[PDB]
């Protein structure tokens, strides 16, 4: 089944893959095998960037699939049925896109979430942990909902911090406050 629909990015194609292999419940396996084929495509960069660039026939594209399963015969049959579709539609540009999306869908199914606490400067690990504690304490990140709060450096948010995840952010920074301060003292 869908682990929540991903569409807006033509990720419904990925969703379809997800739910189809979710109904076979071989999603961890699928994800791992997908990593392996994606990695050996990238690690065959000559004609794993230019064989990610369509120009292949029906027969040559099919023979590329045959070459792909020559690369490893452990790959999970559902993403091999997806490969048939991708060969036939000759689509393959959103192949690493599908890998990434399947990953997103997978870790959504797992319920693991990433996170960033963008600042204009490096952010302490104590800060990561304390905010992670606070955030876990907040109902916003419960348990079963993982969070990887990371530092990002982005001078775009000049000084301060913004915590981000799940379309929920807390922005206590200098830049936003300054913006408001200036504006209000221009009133």
């Amino acid at each position: 089944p869908p682990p929540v629909r991903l569409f807006g990015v033509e990720g419904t194609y990925a969703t379809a893959l997800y739910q189809a292999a979710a109904k076979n419940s071989s999603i961890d396996a699928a994800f791992q095998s997908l990593q392996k084929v994606e990695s050996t495509v990238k690690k065959n960069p000559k004609l794993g960037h230019l064989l990610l660039n369509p120009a292949l026939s029906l027969k040559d594209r099919n023979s590329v699939i045959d070459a792909i399963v020559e690369t490893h015969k452990n790959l999970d049959g559902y993403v091999v049925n997806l490969l048939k579709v991708l060969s036939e539609n000759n689509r393959l540009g959103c192949f690493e896109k599908i890998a990434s999306d399947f990953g997103v869908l997978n870790d959504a199914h797992n319920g693991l979430l990433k996170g960033t606490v963008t600042s204009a400067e490096p952010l302490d690990p104590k800060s990561f942990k304390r905010i992670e504690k606070a955030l876990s304490a907040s109902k916003l990140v419960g348990q079963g909902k993982s969070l990887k709060l990371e530092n990002v450096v982005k001078p775009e948010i000049k000084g301060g911090l913004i915590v981000e995840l799940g379309d929920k952010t807390v922005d206590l920074s200098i830049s936003t406050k300054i913006q408001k301060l200036n504006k209000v003292l221009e009133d």
Binding site: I162, D167, V170, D171, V184
Partner: protein
């Protein structure tokens, strides 16, 4: 002083909370952003971009929610977060706007500082029902005789001012405001129209001239000027009538009577045209997507003569569409014509002909009322219409210069004098008590004899004479407002007294 006000401002900011909505800008450029995220987004809501731009959101899509920017492109940057204001668009509405120029978002752009608005309201308030209406009985007199006589204007009534651009297009409306100075000066509150002049698509200099004229005529006090200048954003231009409407509705709701001039809706339509096509919505007929009718209709139907329950408060509307080439078959002009309760066609050729105001009276109609004009004035201008109607046919015969029937040329002779009588110079209205005599004289044919050249001379002198002698007569017309037998006879005697001599 300035320090104290600033100290209050500094004190006025402190502390905030978690933002449960976000979305990251992606598209940006074309002044219309589309942001990814935002599911909490209630439609038409106002969303604060982290740049400092605010844009309401009019298109929701399961990809990228289309937030129409009010602010500048460069300020917005791709990947910015937008945090929902969480409020559908709203404007402060009250009486503080009386004597104020305001931009679309209700900021005093005259810079008479803050507004003492008694509320905020929403711009999507819907038109009152059948039951919340009452019968229309509230005359409105523009001080232009032709308007009152031919197309009598009530309250809660829509009259569409249509005709070629800037042929004093603004000036016709301003004349109404000036004769409505007399009622405004008058202490009858329900006869005090708080006039709301909406200026869409016009340059600051034009507006500055208008506000100068209004302040000169010191009508600015009861006037509210709602503006969406040429500079101001296309969403803001679309939103400007609807928020003007909200300000009007506060008067209307209170039982107070008010008047809204929507000048010019044609530029509003262009704004919605732009807006819609950069929301990528399919072009309508003439690139104004169909539902533009829906947009305009909801706006226009909020002019209503409300029930006695609602305090009789009637917001009256005068839409203004400046038809290019008199092209009324254009989709928006066709649409508006159907909606409105009158049309006040003006014509450029008649302007050139020297008829100023230049009114194409053949297509000027007011489908509603006659309690939309004074009873006295109804009696006198009864056959003003008939004479003029005969005159139209007669004028056609007169053209080609074929030897007219003496009777047709009697009509022609009478008709011509009437035409000269109607003309009035801009920014000079006329009080109704002294419009009744002029029409009496004309209609009772006493002017028919008086030569065309000296009709203008006669008119001026007649007024002076009535001020001197039959000022008792004027007082009675003012006091009783329906011509009695005694008044008709008195007036006949007076008219005879100055028509002869």
């Amino acid at each position: 002083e300035v320090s104290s006000i600033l100290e209050e401002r500094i004190k006025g900011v402190s502390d905030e909370a978690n933002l449960n909505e976000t979305g990251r800008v992606l598209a940006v450029g074309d002044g219309i952003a589309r942001v990814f995220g935002l599911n909490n987004i209630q439609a038409e809501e106002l969303v604060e971009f982290s740049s400092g731009v605010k844009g309401m959101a009019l298109n929701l899509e399961p990809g990228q929610v289309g937030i129409v920017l009010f602010g500048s492109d460069r300020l917005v940057k791709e990947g910015e977060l937008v945090k929902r204001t969480g409020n559908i668009v709203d404007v402060p509405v009250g009486p503080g706007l009386l004597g104020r120029v305001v931009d679309a978002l209700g900021n005093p752009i005259d810079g008479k500082g803050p507004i003492d608005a008694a509320g905020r309201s929403r711009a999507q308030v819907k038109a009152p029902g059948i039951l919340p209406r009452r019968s229309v009985h509230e005359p409105v007199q523009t001080g232009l005789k032709a308007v009152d006589a031919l197309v009598p204007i009530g309250r809660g009534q829509r009259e569409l001012i249509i005709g070629d651009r800037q042929t004093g297009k603004t000036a016709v409306a301003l004349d109404t405001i000036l004769n409505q100075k007399r009622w405004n000066n008058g202490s009858d509150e329900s006869k005090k129209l708080y006039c709301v002049y909406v200026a869409v698509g016009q340059k600051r200099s034009t507006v500055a001239q208008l506000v100068q004229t209004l302040e000169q005529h010191d009508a600015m006090k009861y006037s509210i000027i709602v503006a969406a200048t040429a500079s101001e954003a296309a969403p803001l231009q679309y939103l400007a009538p609807f928020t003007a409407a909200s300000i009007g509705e506060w008067f209307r709701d209170n039982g107070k009577h008010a008047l809204i001039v929507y000048d010019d809706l044609s530029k509003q339509a262009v704004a919605y045209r732009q807006l819609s096509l950069l929301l990528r919505r399919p072009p309508g007929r003439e690139a104004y997507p169909g539902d533009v009718f829906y947009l305009h209709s909801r706006l226009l139907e909020r002019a209503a003569k409300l029930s006695e329950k609602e305090g009789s408060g009637s917001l009256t509307a005068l839409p203004v569409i400046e038809t290019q080439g008199g092209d009324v078959s254009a989709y928006i002009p066709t649409n508006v014509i159907s909606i409105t309760d009158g049309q006040i066609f003006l014509e450029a050729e008649l302007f050139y002909k020297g008829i100023r105001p230049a009114i194409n009276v053949g297509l000027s109609v007011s489908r509603v009322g006659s309690a939309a004009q004074v009873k006295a004035l109804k009696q006198v201008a009864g056959s003003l219409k008939l004479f003029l109607a005969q005159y139209r046919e007669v004028a056609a015969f007169a053209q080609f210069g074929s030897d007219l029937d003496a009777s047709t040329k009697q009509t022609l002779v009478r008709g011509e004098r009437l035409t000269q009588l109607l003309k009035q110079n801009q920014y000079s209205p006329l009080a109704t008590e002294e419009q009744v005599p002029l029409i009496y004289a004309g209609v009772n044919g006493h002017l028919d004899g008086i030569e065309l050249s000296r009709i203008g001379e006669f008119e001026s002198s007649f007024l002076s004479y009535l001020k001197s002698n039959h000022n008792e007569l004027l007082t009675e017309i003012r006091e009783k407002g329906e011509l009695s037998k005694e008044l008709l006879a008195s007036l006949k005697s007076a008219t005879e007294s100055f028509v002869a001599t």
